[PDB]
Amino acid sequence: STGSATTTPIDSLDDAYITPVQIGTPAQTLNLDFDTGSSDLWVFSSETTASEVDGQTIYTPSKSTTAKLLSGATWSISYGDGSSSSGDVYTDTVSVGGLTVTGQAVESAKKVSSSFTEDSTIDGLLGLAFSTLNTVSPTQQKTFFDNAKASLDSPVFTADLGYHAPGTYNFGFIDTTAYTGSITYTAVSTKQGFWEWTSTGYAVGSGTFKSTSIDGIADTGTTLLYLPATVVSAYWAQVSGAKSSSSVGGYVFPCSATLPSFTFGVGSARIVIPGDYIDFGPISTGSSSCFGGIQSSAGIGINIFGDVALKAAFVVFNGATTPTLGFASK
Numbered sequence: 304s305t306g307s308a309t310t311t312p313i314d315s316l317d318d319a320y321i322t323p324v325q326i327g328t329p330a331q332t333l334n335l336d337f338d339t340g341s342s343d344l345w346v347f348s349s350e351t352t353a354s355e356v357d358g359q360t361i362y363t364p365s366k367s368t369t370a371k372l373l374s375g376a377t378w379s380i381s382y383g384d385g386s387s388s389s390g391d392v393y394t395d396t397v398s399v400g401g402l403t404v405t406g407q408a409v410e411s412a413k414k415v416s417s418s419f420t421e422d423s424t425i426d427g428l429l430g431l432a433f434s435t436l437n438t439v440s441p442t443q444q445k446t447f448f449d450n451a452k453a454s455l456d457s458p459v460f461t462a463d464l465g466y467h468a469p470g471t472y473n474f475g476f477i478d479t480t481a482y483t484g485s486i487t488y489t490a491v492s493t494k495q496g497f498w499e500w501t502s503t504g505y506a507v508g509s510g511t512f513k514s515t516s517i518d519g520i521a522d523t524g525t526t527l528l529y530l531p532a533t534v535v536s537a538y539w540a541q542v543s544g545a546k547s548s549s550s551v552g553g554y555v556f557p558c559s560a561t562l563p564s565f566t567f568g569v570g571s572a573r574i575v576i577p578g579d580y581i582d583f584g585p586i587s588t589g590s591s592s593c594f595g596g597i598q599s600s601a602g603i604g605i606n607i608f609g610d611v612a613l614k615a616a617f618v619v620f621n622g623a624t625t626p627t628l629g630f631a632s633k
């Protein structure tokens with residue numbers, strides 16, 4: 304089997320991407336944030352505290368003939384941005400892009416933090432990191448990908464995120480029309496439960512490539528590119544008037560600037576992030592200070608290849624017995 308679904312930016316900045324997901328029978332379609340940095344499929348639901356729901360579409364298990372309470376199971380998750388959610392668990396039929404899993408754990412939120420309530424466009428998350436991070440207790444649950452894997456034509460999924468445009472998540476196949484050149488594969492460590500890999504270095508603009516190992520994660524659920532402070536300082540030093548602002552919480556730059564590209568290495572291959580991808584616009588409405596898309600990972604404890612990086616590439620998440628990542632230009 305295979306599946307193919309379109310993923311759509313939630314706003315004009317590509318802050319996140321939503322993908323429609325069918326849950327239950329008859330289908331209830333919710334727009335989920337596919338997150339390769341976490342391992343829970345959780346949804347706004349008929350159980351979510353009413354004051355914490357503001358425009359999201361909810362999953363109502365009582366209206367699904369295939370829903371069953373997973374008795375005694377609870378979940379609770381905290382993300383890198385300080386957001387959180389928790390609740391109880393149902394099993395139900397879940398389909399993405401035509402690919403169906405029966406008996407998927409659907410984590411029903413009883414509580415969500417303010418950042419979720421305030422984002423009306425995201426109805427929940429679909430985690431695609433390794434199932435070792437799943438938070439369900441006392442019986443850990445599998446991701447949608449791990450439950451689909453054995454049925455797939457190939458044990459893979461691909462992320463093809465758009466810049467200010469829709470893109471695609473595919474399950475079970477490589478679309479050889481979706482990228483240019485060849486795919487370069489690189490090793491993955493699953494020790495922390497992430498798609499963790501080592502970039503071979505970077506360049507700023509037309510500058511020389513610096514060969515240096517940068518360990519980080521491929522995380523579709525993180526907007527920005529978080530790299531070591533040395534690398535980030537080298538990038539922003541090429542933008543007149545850029546500076547790190549403790550008040551704003553990262554590097555800002557004049558909105559009048561033209562940003563340089565940023566290149567990262569994947570083995571001997573190179574992925575180029577155009578400068579435009581690094582512009583996240585005014586820090587507040589009408590400001591002439593703009594927020595940068597490359598930020599320091601110092602204090603986060605890991606480097607994160609978030610959407611700024613991933614949307615410059617066709618990315619293969621190879622879930623074979625020995626996982627690997629692949630990157631191609633597009």
Ligand code: NA
Pocket residue numbers: none
């Ligand atoms: Na922000």
